[PDB]
Coordinates of N, CA and C and ligand atoms in Angstrom, one line a residue:
Chain A
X1 N 2.9 8.3 -7.6 CA 2.4 7.0 -6.4 C 1.6 7.3 -5.5
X2 N 1.0 5.7 -5.8 CA -0.3 5.9 -4.5 C 0.6 5.2 -3.6
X3 N 0.3 5.2 -2.3 CA 0.7 5.4 -0.9 C 2.0 3.3 -0.6
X4 N 1.6 2.5 -1.2 CA 2.0 0.8 -0.7 C 2.3 0.9 -1.5
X5 N 2.9 1.2 -2.8 CA 3.4 1.6 -3.7 C 4.7 2.2 -3.5
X6 N 4.0 3.4 -3.1 CA 5.9 4.9 -2.7 C 6.7 4.5 -1.3
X7 N 5.5 3.2 -0.6 CA 6.4 3.0 0.9 C 7.4 1.8 0.7
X8 N 6.8 1.3 -0.7 CA 7.7 -0.1 -0.8 C 8.7 0.2 -2.0
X9 N 8.9 0.5 -3.3 CA 9.8 1.1 -3.5 C 11.0 2.2 -2.8
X10 N 10.1 3.1 -1.7 CA 11.2 3.4 -0.6 C 12.6 2.2 0.1
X11 N 11.1 1.4 0.7 CA 12.4 1.0 1.4 C 13.4 0.1 0.3
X12 N 13.1 -0.2 -0.9 CA 14.1 -0.7 -1.8 C 14.6 -0.1 -2.6
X13 N 15.2 0.7 -2.2 CA 16.0 2.3 -2.2 C 17.1 2.7 -1.5
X14 N 16.2 2.8 -0.3 CA 17.4 2.8 0.7 C 18.4 1.7 1.4
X15 N 17.8 -0.2 0.7 CA 18.6 -0.7 0.7 C 19.9 -1.1 0.4
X16 N 19.1 -0.9 -1.0 CA 19.7 -1.0 -1.7 C 21.0 0.2 -2.0
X17 N 21.2 1.6 -2.3 CA 21.9 2.0 -1.5 C 22.6 2.2 -0.6
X18 N 21.9 1.6 0.6 CA 22.8 1.3 1.7 C 23.7 0.3 1.9
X19 N 23.5 -1.0 0.6 CA 24.7 -1.4 0.3 C 25.8 -0.9 0.3
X20 N 25.4 0.0 -1.1 CA 26.6 0.5 -2.1 C 27.3 1.3 -1.3
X21 N 26.9 2.2 -0.5 CA 27.6 3.3 0.7 C 28.4 2.6 1.3
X22 N 27.3 1.2 2.0 CA 28.7 0.6 2.9 C 29.8 -0.1 2.5
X23 N 29.4 -0.6 1.3 CA 30.0 -1.4 0.6 C 31.4 -0.5 0.3
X24 N 31.1 0.8 -0.7 CA 32.5 1.9 -0.6 C 33.1 2.4 0.2
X25 N 32.0 2.7 1.8 CA 33.2 2.8 2.1 C 34.1 1.5 3.2
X26 N 33.6 1.3 3.6 CA 34.6 -0.5 3.4 C 35.3 -0.1 2.1
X27 N 35.3 0.1 1.4 CA 36.9 -0.6 0.1 C 37.4 1.6 -0.2
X28 N 37.4 1.7 1.8 CA 38.4 3.1 1.7 C 37.6 4.2 1.5
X29 N 37.4 4.6 0.7 CA 35.8 5.5 0.6 C 34.6 6.0 -0.5
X30 N 34.1 6.4 -0.2 CA 33.4 7.3 -1.0 C 32.9 7.6 -1.7
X31 N 32.2 7.2 -3.3 CA 32.1 7.9 -4.4 C 31.0 9.3 -4.1
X32 N 31.2 10.5 -4.7 CA 30.4 11.5 -4.5 C 28.7 11.6 -4.8
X33 N 28.1 11.1 -5.1 CA 27.4 10.5 -6.6 C 26.7 9.0 -4.9
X34 N 27.6 8.3 -5.1 CA 27.1 7.3 -4.0 C 26.0 7.8 -2.6
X35 N 26.8 9.2 -1.7 CA 26.3 9.3 -0.3 C 25.6 10.1 -0.6
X36 N 25.4 10.5 -1.5 CA 23.8 12.2 -2.5 C 22.5 11.6 -3.1
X37 N 23.6 9.7 -3.5 CA 22.2 9.1 -3.1 C 21.6 7.6 -1.7
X38 N 22.2 7.4 -1.5 CA 21.7 7.1 0.0 C 21.4 8.0 0.7
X39 N 22.0 9.7 0.9 CA 21.2 10.5 1.5 C 19.8 10.7 1.2
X40 N 20.0 10.6 -0.2 CA 18.4 11.3 -0.9 C 17.2 10.5 -0.8
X41 N 18.3 8.8 0.0 CA 17.3 7.6 0.4 C 16.9 7.9 1.2
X42 N 17.7 8.4 2.7 CA 17.7 8.6 4.0 C 16.4 9.7 4.5
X43 N 16.3 11.2 3.6 CA 15.6 11.4 4.0 C 14.3 11.4 3.6
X44 N 14.4 10.5 2.6 CA 12.6 9.6 2.7 C 11.9 9.1 3.6
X45 N 12.8 8.7 4.4 CA 12.7 7.7 5.6 C 11.8 7.1 6.0
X46 N 11.4 6.4 7.0 CA 10.2 6.8 7.6 C 11.2 6.8 9.3
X47 N 11.7 6.5 9.2 CA 12.8 6.8 10.4 C 13.6 7.8 11.0
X48 N 13.7 8.9 11.6 CA 13.6 9.6 12.3 C 14.7 9.8 11.9
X49 N 15.6 8.9 12.6 CA 17.5 9.0 12.8 C 18.2 8.3 11.6
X50 N 17.4 8.0 10.4 CA 17.6 8.2 8.9 C 18.0 9.3 8.8
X51 N 16.5 10.5 8.5 CA 17.0 11.4 8.6 C 17.5 11.9 8.9
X52 N 18.0 12.2 10.3 CA 18.6 13.2 10.5 C 20.7 12.0 9.9
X53 N 20.8 11.5 9.5 CA 21.8 11.0 8.7 C 21.9 11.3 8.2
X54 N 21.1 11.8 7.1 CA 20.6 12.0 5.7 C 21.2 13.3 6.0
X55 N 20.9 14.6 6.5 CA 20.9 15.7 6.4 C 22.7 15.5 7.6
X56 N 23.1 14.9 7.7 CA 24.1 15.1 8.5 C 25.6 14.5 7.0
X57 N 24.4 12.9 6.3 CA 25.6 13.6 5.1 C 25.8 14.0 3.4
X58 N 24.6 15.3 3.3 CA 24.5 16.2 2.6 C 25.2 16.9 3.2
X59 N 25.1 17.5 4.4 CA 25.6 18.3 5.3 C 27.8 18.7 5.0
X60 N 27.5 16.8 4.3 CA 29.5 16.6 4.1 C 29.9 16.6 2.7
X61 N 28.4 16.3 2.2 CA 29.0 17.2 0.8 C 28.9 18.6 0.0
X62 N 27.9 18.4 1.1 CA 28.2 20.8 0.4 C 28.9 21.3 0.0
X63 N 30.1 21.5 1.6 CA 30.9 22.3 0.6 C 32.1 21.8 -0.7
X64 N 32.4 20.4 -1.1 CA 32.2 19.8 -2.0 C 31.9 19.8 -3.8
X65 N 30.3 21.0 -3.7 CA 29.5 20.9 -4.5 C 30.3 21.5 -5.5
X66 N 30.0 21.7 -6.5 CA 29.2 22.5 -7.6 C 28.3 23.2 -7.5
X67 N 28.1 24.2 -8.1 CA 27.8 25.3 -7.6 C 25.4 24.2 -7.9
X68 N 25.6 24.1 -8.9 CA 24.1 22.7 -9.3 C 23.4 21.8 -8.1
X69 N 25.0 21.3 -8.1 CA 24.9 20.3 -6.7 C 24.7 21.1 -5.1
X70 N 25.4 22.2 -5.5 CA 25.1 22.9 -3.9 C 23.9 23.1 -4.2
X71 N 23.1 23.8 -5.0 CA 21.3 24.3 -4.8 C 21.4 22.5 -5.1
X72 N 21.0 21.2 -5.6 CA 20.1 20.5 -5.2 C 20.6 19.2 -3.8
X73 N 21.8 19.6 -3.5 CA 21.5 19.6 -1.9 C 20.8 19.9 -0.6
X74 N 21.0 21.9 -1.0 CA 20.3 22.0 -0.1 C 18.6 21.4 -0.5
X75 N 18.2 21.7 -1.4 CA 17.0 20.6 -1.8 C 16.8 19.8 -0.7
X76 N 17.3 19.0 -0.2 CA 16.9 18.4 0.1 C 17.3 17.5 1.6
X77 N 18.4 19.1 2.0 CA 18.3 19.7 3.3 C 17.0 20.7 3.8
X78 N 16.9 21.3 3.5 CA 15.5 21.9 3.3 C 13.8 20.5 3.4
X79 N 13.8 19.2 2.8 CA 13.2 18.4 2.5 C 13.3 17.5 4.3
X80 N 14.7 16.8 3.9 CA 14.3 16.3 5.7 C 14.7 17.3 6.8
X81 N 14.6 18.3 7.0 CA 14.9 19.2 8.3 C 13.0 19.2 8.4
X82 N 12.6 19.7 7.1 CA 10.7 20.1 7.1 C 10.6 18.8 7.8
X83 N 10.9 18.0 7.2 CA 10.3 16.6 7.9 C 10.8 15.9 9.2
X84 N 12.0 16.8 9.8 CA 12.6 16.3 11.2 C 10.9 17.9 12.6
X85 N 10.5 18.2 11.4 CA 10.1 20.1 12.3 C 10.8 20.8 12.5
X86 N 12.0 21.0 12.3 CA 13.3 21.6 12.1 C 12.6 23.2 11.1
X87 N 11.9 23.6 11.5 CA 11.1 24.3 9.8 C 11.7 25.5 10.2
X88 N 12.1 26.1 11.1 CA 13.0 27.0 10.9 C 14.2 27.6 10.2
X89 N 15.2 26.1 10.5 CA 15.5 25.8 9.4 C 15.7 25.2 8.5
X90 N 14.6 24.4 8.0 CA 14.3 24.2 6.6 C 13.6 25.5 5.5
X91 N 12.6 26.9 6.2 CA 12.7 28.1 5.5 C 13.9 28.5 5.0
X92 N 14.4 28.8 6.3 CA 15.9 29.5 6.0 C 16.5 28.7 4.2
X93 N 16.1 27.5 4.6 CA 17.1 26.5 3.4 C 16.5 26.8 1.9
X94 N 15.2 26.8 2.3 CA 14.5 26.7 1.0 C 14.4 28.3 0.2
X95 N 14.0 29.4 1.8 CA 14.4 31.0 1.3 C 15.0 31.3 0.2
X96 N 16.5 30.6 0.4 CA 18.3 31.1 -0.2 C 18.3 30.5 -0.9
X97 N 17.4 29.1 -1.5 CA 17.9 28.1 -2.9 C 16.8 29.0 -3.4
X98 N 15.9 29.8 -3.2 CA 14.3 30.2 -3.9 C 15.2 31.3 -4.8
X99 N 16.3 32.2 -3.5 CA 17.2 33.2 -4.8 C 17.8 32.9 -5.3
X100 N 17.7 31.9 -6.1 CA 18.9 31.3 -7.1 C 17.9 30.8 -7.8
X101 N 17.1 29.9 -7.6 CA 16.4 28.9 -9.0 C 14.9 29.9 -8.2
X102 N 14.4 31.6 -8.9 CA 13.1 31.8 -8.2 C 12.3 30.4 -9.1
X103 N 11.9 30.2 -10.7 CA 11.2 29.7 -10.8 C 11.4 27.9 -10.5
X104 N 11.6 27.8 -9.4 CA 11.3 26.1 -9.6 C 10.6 25.6 -7.9
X105 N 9.2 26.1 -9.2 CA 7.4 25.8 -7.7 C 8.0 24.4 -7.2
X106 N 8.9 24.1 -7.3 CA 9.0 22.5 -6.6 C 9.6 23.2 -4.7
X107 N 10.4 24.0 -5.3 CA 10.7 25.0 -3.8 C 9.9 25.5 -3.2
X108 N 9.2 26.2 -4.0 CA 8.3 26.9 -3.9 C 6.8 26.3 -3.4
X109 N 6.4 25.4 -3.7 CA 5.6 24.6 -3.1 C 5.9 24.3 -1.1
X110 N 7.4 23.4 -1.6 CA 7.7 22.8 -0.1 C 7.8 24.5 0.3
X111 N 8.3 25.8 0.3 CA 8.3 26.3 1.1 C 6.9 26.9 2.0
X112 N 5.8 26.5 0.4 CA 4.2 26.7 1.3 C 4.1 25.7 2.4
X113 N 5.1 24.5 1.9 CA 4.2 23.1 3.6 C 5.2 23.8 4.8
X114 N 6.0 24.5 4.7 CA 6.4 24.8 6.7 C 6.1 25.8 6.3
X115 N 6.4 27.0 6.1 CA 4.5 27.7 6.5 C 3.3 27.4 6.7
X116 N 3.0 26.7 5.3 CA 1.4 26.2 6.6 C 1.7 25.1 8.0
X117 N 2.8 24.5 8.1 CA 3.3 23.8 9.5 C 3.4 25.0 10.4
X118 N 4.0 25.7 10.6 CA 4.7 26.8 11.3 C 3.7 27.7 11.6
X119 N 2.0 27.3 11.0 CA 0.9 28.1 11.0 C 0.1 27.7 11.9
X120 N -0.1 25.9 12.2 CA -0.2 25.4 12.7 C 0.5 25.6 13.9
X121 N 1.2 25.2 14.2 CA 2.4 25.1 15.9 C 1.1 27.7 16.8
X122 N 1.7 27.7 15.5 CA 1.1 29.6 15.9 C 2.7 29.8 15.8
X123 N 4.2 29.0 15.7 CA 5.7 30.1 15.6 C 5.6 30.2 14.4
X124 N 4.7 31.1 13.7 CA 4.4 31.8 12.5 C 3.0 33.2 12.6
Chain B
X1 N 7.1 9.6 3.0 CA 5.9 10.4 3.3 C 5.1 11.4 2.8
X2 N 4.8 11.9 2.8 CA 2.7 12.9 2.9 C 2.5 12.5 1.2
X3 N 1.6 12.6 1.2 CA 0.7 12.5 -0.3 C 1.9 14.0 -1.3
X4 N 1.4 15.4 -0.8 CA 2.6 16.5 -1.3 C 3.9 16.6 -1.8
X5 N 4.1 16.6 -0.6 CA 5.9 16.2 -0.2 C 6.1 15.3 -1.8
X6 N 5.9 14.2 -1.6 CA 6.0 12.7 -2.2 C 6.9 13.6 -3.4
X7 N 4.9 14.5 -3.6 CA 5.3 14.8 -5.8 C 5.8 15.1 -5.9
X8 N 5.8 16.6 -5.2 CA 6.9 18.1 -5.7 C 9.1 17.2 -5.3
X9 N 8.4 16.5 -4.5 CA 9.7 15.9 -4.8 C 11.0 15.0 -5.7
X10 N 9.3 14.5 -6.5 CA 9.7 13.1 -7.2 C 10.2 14.6 -8.7
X11 N 8.8 15.4 -9.3 CA 9.6 16.5 -9.6 C 11.1 17.1 -9.4
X12 N 10.9 17.5 -8.7 CA 12.8 17.8 -8.6 C 13.9 17.1 -8.7
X13 N 13.6 15.2 -9.2 CA 14.6 14.1 -9.1 C 14.9 14.0 -10.4
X14 N 13.3 13.6 -11.6 CA 13.1 13.4 -12.6 C 13.5 14.8 -13.9
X15 N 14.0 16.0 -13.4 CA 14.2 17.5 -13.4 C 15.9 17.7 -14.0
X16 N 15.7 17.0 -12.2 CA 17.6 17.0 -11.9 C 17.9 15.7 -13.4
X17 N 18.1 14.5 -13.2 CA 17.8 13.4 -13.5 C 18.4 13.4 -14.7
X18 N 16.7 14.4 -15.0 CA 16.9 14.5 -17.5 C 17.1 15.5 -17.7
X19 N 18.6 16.4 -17.0 CA 19.6 17.2 -17.3 C 20.4 17.3 -17.0
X20 N 20.6 15.6 -16.4 CA 22.2 15.3 -16.4 C 22.2 14.3 -16.9
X21 N 21.4 13.5 -17.9 CA 21.1 12.5 -19.0 C 21.5 12.8 -19.8
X22 N 20.6 14.2 -20.1 CA 20.4 14.8 -21.8 C 21.7 15.3 -22.0
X23 N 22.2 16.1 -21.3 CA 23.6 16.6 -21.1 C 24.7 15.6 -21.3
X24 N 25.1 14.2 -20.7 CA 25.6 12.9 -21.2 C 26.0 12.9 -22.1
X25 N 24.2 12.5 -22.7 CA 24.0 12.5 -24.0 C 24.3 13.1 -25.4
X26 N 23.8 14.3 -24.9 CA 24.8 15.0 -26.1 C 26.3 14.9 -26.1
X27 N 27.2 14.8 -24.6 CA 28.7 14.7 -25.0 C 28.8 13.9 -25.1
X28 N 28.0 12.4 -26.2 CA 29.1 11.5 -26.5 C 27.7 9.9 -26.0
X29 N 28.7 10.0 -24.7 CA 27.1 8.1 -24.1 C 27.2 8.9 -22.5
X30 N 26.1 8.8 -22.6 CA 25.5 8.4 -20.5 C 26.5 7.2 -20.3
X31 N 26.5 7.3 -19.1 CA 27.0 6.0 -17.3 C 25.5 5.2 -17.4
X32 N 26.0 4.3 -16.8 CA 25.5 3.6 -16.4 C 24.6 3.7 -15.3
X33 N 24.6 5.1 -14.7 CA 24.0 5.3 -13.4 C 23.2 6.4 -13.6
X34 N 23.3 7.1 -14.5 CA 22.8 8.1 -14.9 C 22.0 8.3 -15.2
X35 N 22.1 6.7 -16.6 CA 20.9 6.0 -17.5 C 19.7 5.3 -16.0
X36 N 20.3 4.6 -15.0 CA 19.3 4.2 -13.8 C 18.5 4.8 -13.1
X37 N 19.1 6.3 -13.7 CA 19.2 7.1 -12.2 C 17.3 8.1 -12.1
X38 N 17.7 7.5 -14.2 CA 16.5 9.2 -15.1 C 15.6 7.6 -14.6
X39 N 16.4 7.1 -15.5 CA 15.1 5.8 -15.1 C 14.2 5.0 -14.0
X40 N 14.6 5.2 -12.9 CA 14.0 5.2 -11.8 C 13.5 6.2 -11.8
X41 N 13.1 7.9 -12.3 CA 12.9 8.2 -11.7 C 11.8 8.8 -12.5
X42 N 12.1 8.3 -14.6 CA 11.0 8.2 -15.1 C 9.8 7.0 -14.7
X43 N 10.1 5.9 -15.0 CA 8.9 5.4 -13.6 C 8.1 5.5 -12.7
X44 N 8.3 6.3 -11.8 CA 7.7 6.6 -10.8 C 6.9 7.6 -11.4
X45 N 6.6 8.9 -12.7 CA 6.4 9.8 -12.6 C 5.2 9.8 -13.1
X46 N 4.1 11.0 -13.1 CA 2.5 10.5 -13.2 C 2.2 10.5 -14.4
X47 N 3.4 10.3 -15.7 CA 3.1 10.1 -17.7 C 3.2 8.7 -17.2
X48 N 2.3 8.5 -18.4 CA 2.7 8.1 -19.1 C 3.8 7.8 -20.0
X49 N 3.9 8.3 -20.9 CA 4.9 8.2 -21.7 C 6.6 8.4 -20.6
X50 N 6.6 9.0 -19.7 CA 7.5 8.8 -18.8 C 7.9 7.3 -18.4
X51 N 6.7 6.6 -18.0 CA 6.9 5.4 -17.7 C 7.7 4.3 -18.6
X52 N 7.1 4.3 -19.6 CA 7.3 3.7 -20.9 C 8.7 4.1 -21.6
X53 N 9.2 6.0 -21.1 CA 10.6 6.3 -20.8 C 11.5 5.4 -20.5
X54 N 11.3 5.1 -19.1 CA 12.0 4.9 -18.0 C 12.4 3.2 -18.5
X55 N 11.0 2.1 -18.5 CA 10.6 1.0 -19.0 C 11.5 0.4 -20.7
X56 N 12.1 1.7 -21.3 CA 12.6 1.7 -21.9 C 14.9 2.0 -22.4
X57 N 14.8 2.4 -21.1 CA 16.3 2.8 -20.0 C 16.7 1.6 -20.0
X58 N 15.0 1.2 -19.1 CA 16.0 -0.2 -17.8 C 16.2 -1.3 -19.2
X59 N 15.4 -1.8 -19.5 CA 15.2 -2.5 -20.6 C 16.8 -2.7 -21.7
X60 N 17.2 -1.5 -22.2 CA 19.0 -1.4 -22.6 C 19.8 -1.7 -21.9
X61 N 19.9 -1.3 -20.2 CA 21.0 -1.0 -19.0 C 20.9 -2.7 -18.9
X62 N 19.8 -3.7 -18.7 CA 19.4 -5.3 -18.8 C 20.3 -5.6 -19.4
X63 N 20.5 -6.2 -21.0 CA 21.7 -7.2 -21.4 C 23.3 -6.4 -21.0
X64 N 23.6 -5.7 -19.7 CA 25.2 -5.1 -20.5 C 25.4 -4.8 -18.2
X65 N 24.3 -5.5 -17.2 CA 24.9 -5.3 -16.3 C 24.8 -6.8 -16.0
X66 N 25.3 -6.9 -14.4 CA 26.3 -7.6 -13.4 C 24.9 -8.0 -12.2
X67 N 25.2 -9.4 -12.3 CA 24.0 -10.1 -11.1 C 23.3 -9.2 -10.6
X68 N 24.2 -8.2 -9.6 CA 22.7 -6.6 -8.8 C 22.2 -6.9 -9.4
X69 N 23.1 -5.8 -10.7 CA 22.2 -5.0 -11.4 C 21.1 -5.4 -11.8
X70 N 21.3 -6.9 -12.4 CA 20.3 -6.6 -13.8 C 19.1 -6.8 -12.1
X71 N 19.0 -7.9 -11.1 CA 17.7 -8.0 -9.9 C 17.5 -6.2 -10.1
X72 N 18.0 -5.3 -9.4 CA 17.2 -4.4 -9.1 C 17.3 -3.3 -10.6
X73 N 16.8 -3.8 -11.8 CA 16.7 -3.5 -13.0 C 15.6 -3.9 -13.0
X74 N 15.4 -5.4 -12.6 CA 14.1 -5.8 -13.5 C 13.0 -5.4 -11.9
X75 N 13.4 -4.7 -10.6 CA 12.4 -4.8 -10.7 C 11.8 -3.6 -10.3
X76 N 12.6 -2.5 -11.2 CA 11.9 -0.9 -12.1 C 11.4 -1.2 -13.0
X77 N 11.6 -2.3 -13.5 CA 10.8 -3.1 -14.4 C 9.7 -3.4 -14.5
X78 N 9.6 -4.3 -13.2 CA 8.2 -4.8 -12.2 C 7.5 -3.4 -12.0
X79 N 8.0 -2.7 -10.7 CA 6.9 -1.6 -10.8 C 6.9 -0.7 -11.6
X80 N 7.4 -0.3 -13.0 CA 6.6 0.7 -13.9 C 6.0 0.1 -14.9
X81 N 6.1 -1.3 -15.0 CA 4.8 -2.1 -16.1 C 3.9 -2.2 -14.6
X82 N 3.6 -2.7 -13.9 CA 2.6 -2.3 -13.0 C 1.8 -0.6 -12.7
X83 N 2.7 -0.3 -12.8 CA 1.6 1.2 -13.2 C 1.4 1.8 -14.7
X84 N 2.1 1.1 -15.8 CA 1.2 1.2 -16.9 C 0.5 0.1 -17.0
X85 N -0.6 -0.8 -15.7 CA -1.0 -1.7 -15.7 C -1.4 -2.6 -16.8
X86 N 0.6 -3.7 -16.3 CA 1.1 -4.4 -18.4 C 1.5 -5.8 -16.6
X87 N 0.6 -6.0 -16.7 CA 0.1 -6.8 -14.9 C 1.1 -8.4 -15.5
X88 N 0.8 -8.7 -16.9 CA 1.1 -9.7 -16.6 C 2.6 -10.0 -17.2
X89 N 3.4 -8.7 -17.8 CA 4.5 -8.9 -17.9 C 5.6 -8.1 -16.3
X90 N 5.0 -7.5 -15.0 CA 4.4 -7.1 -14.1 C 5.0 -7.9 -12.9
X91 N 4.1 -9.0 -13.2 CA 4.4 -10.2 -12.1 C 4.9 -11.3 -12.7
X92 N 5.2 -11.8 -13.9 CA 6.4 -12.1 -14.0 C 7.9 -11.6 -14.2
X93 N 8.2 -10.4 -13.7 CA 9.6 -9.9 -13.4 C 9.7 -10.2 -12.3
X94 N 8.4 -9.9 -11.2 CA 8.3 -9.3 -9.9 C 8.6 -11.6 -8.9
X95 N 8.3 -12.2 -10.3 CA 8.8 -13.6 -10.0 C 9.5 -14.2 -9.7
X96 N 10.1 -14.2 -11.2 CA 11.8 -13.9 -11.2 C 12.3 -13.8 -10.7
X97 N 11.9 -12.6 -9.9 CA 12.8 -11.6 -8.5 C 12.9 -12.2 -7.5
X98 N 12.0 -12.3 -6.6 CA 11.7 -13.4 -5.8 C 12.3 -15.1 -5.7
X99 N 12.6 -15.6 -6.9 CA 12.9 -16.9 -6.5 C 14.8 -16.6 -6.9
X100 N 14.7 -15.7 -6.2 CA 16.7 -15.8 -6.8 C 17.1 -14.1 -5.2
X101 N 15.7 -14.0 -4.8 CA 16.1 -12.3 -3.2 C 14.5 -13.4 -2.6
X102 N 14.4 -14.5 -2.0 CA 13.3 -15.2 -1.5 C 13.1 -13.8 -0.7
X103 N 13.6 -13.1 0.1 CA 13.7 -12.4 1.5 C 13.5 -11.0 1.5
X104 N 13.6 -10.8 -0.4 CA 12.6 -9.3 -0.1 C 11.3 -9.3 0.4
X105 N 10.7 -8.2 0.7 CA 9.7 -8.8 1.1 C 8.9 -7.5 0.6
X106 N 9.6 -6.4 -0.4 CA 9.4 -5.4 -0.8 C 8.8 -5.8 -2.0
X107 N 9.2 -6.6 -3.3 CA 9.5 -7.6 -3.9 C 7.9 -8.4 -3.6
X108 N 7.7 -9.0 -3.0 CA 6.5 -9.6 -2.0 C 5.5 -8.2 -2.4
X109 N 5.2 -7.5 -1.6 CA 4.6 -6.6 -2.0 C 3.2 -6.3 -3.1
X110 N 4.6 -6.2 -4.1 CA 4.6 -5.9 -5.3 C 3.7 -6.3 -5.7
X111 N 4.8 -7.8 -5.8 CA 3.9 -9.2 -6.1 C 2.2 -9.3 -5.9
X112 N 2.1 -8.5 -4.7 CA 0.6 -8.8 -3.9 C 0.2 -7.9 -4.8
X113 N 0.6 -6.8 -5.0 CA -0.6 -5.2 -5.2 C -0.4 -5.8 -6.7
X114 N 0.0 -6.5 -7.7 CA 0.2 -6.4 -8.7 C -1.5 -7.6 -9.5
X115 N -0.7 -8.8 -8.0 CA -1.8 -10.0 -7.6 C -3.7 -9.6 -7.7
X116 N -3.4 -8.3 -6.9 CA -4.6 -7.7 -6.5 C -5.5 -7.0 -7.5
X117 N -4.0 -6.1 -8.5 CA -5.5 -5.8 -9.2 C -5.6 -6.3 -10.6
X118 N -5.2 -7.4 -10.5 CA -5.9 -8.1 -11.5 C -6.5 -9.0 -11.7
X119 N -6.8 -9.5 -10.4 CA -8.2 -9.8 -10.0 C -9.9 -8.7 -9.7
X120 N -8.6 -7.6 -10.0 CA -10.5 -5.7 -9.5 C -11.2 -6.1 -10.3
Ligands
CL1 CL1 14.4 6.2 -24.9
CL2 CL1 16.7 -10.8 -0.2

């Protein structure tokens, strides 16, 4: 998607699932899917506080996931940590995922981005 | 997000919810939530056939949604039609949504995009 469209869809997404998350948490407890969707929107946000919150929400889901869900959670932990420039954490997550999903070229392109960013720092 | 990142995350999402949708479909019927989530990914895809399928899935959810859900469906119907260059349909959808959500500047910005592309 072009940039302006991507940004406005991102905002609409985040606001919808924030409402849903805040509604459910007001009504007692938050379903696993609602927490994941909100966290997924948070790690794509333009605000760093949002990304940090999405990471926390993904860490809370991680021990309760099926094996397939845990793979999805680790993907977005690497995304969030990469966007925060927590490169060594992101790199550890995506390498672990690639061991169990070797043909995941999305995870591979993410690893390439993380490596490229660690090179331009000089920290690789 | 930057362009390369946005594209690989879009692929990861689509494939994840395609598996969820197809697995629920084979097992009988598909939940509202999975059909929407798959449609949401499809409308954002780089393939026109995907966008068209997302519009179909959204059109099928629309008669049976609540008031709030319908407004969200119409937003993504506007997005998908805009990306397919179906500008008259897209403008109609977003103008309806703006009548009931007047403070929704994301819908407003989408309307400006539709209006720009029509004048291009
Ligand atoms: Cl279809
Ligand atoms: Cl509003």
